Amino acid sequence: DLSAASHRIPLSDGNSIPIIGLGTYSEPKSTPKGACATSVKVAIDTGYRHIDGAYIYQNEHEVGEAIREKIAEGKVRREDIFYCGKLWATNHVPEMVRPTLERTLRVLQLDYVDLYIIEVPMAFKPGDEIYPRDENGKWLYHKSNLCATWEAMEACKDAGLVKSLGVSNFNRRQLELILNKPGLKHKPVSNQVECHPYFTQPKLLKFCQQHDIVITAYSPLGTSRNPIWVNVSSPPLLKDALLNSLGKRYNKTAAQIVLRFNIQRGVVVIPKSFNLERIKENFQIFDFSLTEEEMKDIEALNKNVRFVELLMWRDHPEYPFHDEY
Ligand SMILES: NC(=O)c1ccc[n+]([C@@H]2O[C@H](COP(=O)([O-])OP(=O)(O)OC[C@H]3O[C@@H](n4cnc5c(N)ncnc54)[C@H](OP(=O)(O)O)[C@@H]3O)[C@@H](O)[C@H]2O)c1
């Protein structure tokens, strides 16, 4: 059973993960400096012990600032905090994996991260530019080799630089390539995918459960609806009639119902908010539960429509979303 004070769930490698985390993507060009750092401090104060970030969000140093300040004020110990970082597509070449993680440790000013994941299964041309395209707008890809990249990840774990290893945006075929690798040393413990009542991931979730992989739900509130990335043809999740009526049964908001839904089925949720009130709101999901009927009601909202389709990379040989799951 899950409580505000105790809500970690086991990972297959013997580690554990707080089932709610603070998401920290925020559009760089429109986000004030300091907003992430403040939000992470507010979150930790509120009771969050998990923060999800990425070097390419351009605010990973702010996460470190926040975490190190709360440690310094003896609010938490490093051991109490779970940070997840990610290896971007431009950094999949095996010899670049460790230097890339070390860059994030410098940025964080921390000695290890709790979870390091392959951010997408697609390899992009190495370089500073996170979204490399040539003069004719053609995407500059690299040939993926998930097993060789995974081997470099394993070596980072053996060097003490990360406690747990995982993936993100992997489909079943891509998981199976790693799970079936000869000489596999560390199985992936986590797969971070989009997941919410309009995209409940029934087949992928079940597959991961069968392999002792925990799913982390990104965009668990249905995203910030940024038209650069988001399928806005889908309606806003938090305006869903049913979720809002379900919220009235418990004096909860649609967001609180949506987060409770996923954590209740052992899915980790990493809602992003840089708003003081909503950071708190999002954490108040341990003082109620959904009935089994309500869990079925919400599952039935599944449209099998993703808000985050990544359509610009549909031609990459390892584009994950052509397969059924
Ligand atoms: N691995 C990947 O490929 C990947 C991809 C996308 C995202 N992620 C991760 O997952 C995290 C979460 O997803 P996301 O940021 O896309 O989306 P999200 O968490 O689903 O929701 C984001 C939006 O919800 C708003 N919001 C937050 N709490 C709310 C509440 N209680 N009521 C109404 N509105 C609320 C936020 O605005 P305010 O900030 O103003 O509250 C923001 O506009 C990211 O921040 C990132 O850490 C991973």
What is the DSSP secondary-structure string of 185-223? -S---EEEEE-BTTB--HHHHHHHHHTT-EEEEESTT--
Q: Is 35 helix (H, G, I), strand (E, B) or coil?
A: helix
Q: Which amino acid is at 303?
A: K
User: Ligand 1: residues within 6 Å at CB?
Assistant: 23-25, 52, 119, 168-169, 192, 218-224, 238, 253, 255, 270-275, 278, 281-282, 308
CA distance 270 to 106: 24
d(CA 96, CA 186): 19
User: What is the identity of the amino acid at 254?
Assistant: A
d(CA 325, CA 277): 36
Q: For ligand 1, pick from 218, 240, 257, 260 the residue to mutate: most ligand atoms within 8 Å of CB.
A: 218
SS3 84: strand
Taking each continuous run of H as one helix and of E as one strand, the counts in the chain are: 10, 10
Distance 224 CA to ligand 1 centre (A): 6
Residues of the domain holding 34: 1-325
Token pair 């389709």 is at which residue? Answer: 309
* Through-space distance between the first and last CA atoms of the chain, rounded to whole angstroms: 30
Q: Counting beta carbons within 10 angstroms of the beta carbon of residue 123, is it exposed (0 to 12), middle (13 to 18) or buried (19 or more)?
A: buried
Domain count, the chain: 1
Instruction: Evaluate whether 192 touches 216 at the Cβ level (below 8 Å).
Output: yes
By three-state DSSP, how is residue 115 classified?
strand
User: Which run of H or E residues covers position 263?
Assistant: helix 254-264
DSSP-derived pairing of the beta strands 162-168 and 50-52? unpaired
Q: Under DSSP, is residue 303 helix (H, G, I), strand (E, B) or coil?
A: coil
Cα separation of 321 and 325, whole Å? Answer: 7
> What are the phi and psi torsion angles at 286 (to 5°)?
-115, 0
Q: Which of 48, 55, 57, 116 is catalytic?
A: 57
Instruction: Please state the atom number of ligand 1 nearest to the C-alpha of residue 273.
Output: 39
As a whole number of angstroms, the distance between CA 126 and CA 92 comes to 8
Class of residue 48 by CB neighbours under 10 A (exposed 0-12, middle 13-18, buried 19+): buried
CATH assignment of the domain containing 241: 3.20.20.100
- CB of 137 within 8 A of CB of 315? no
Residue 315: burial class (beta carbons within 10 Å; 0-12, 13-18, 19+): exposed
Could you tell me the resolution of this structure in angstroms? 1.8
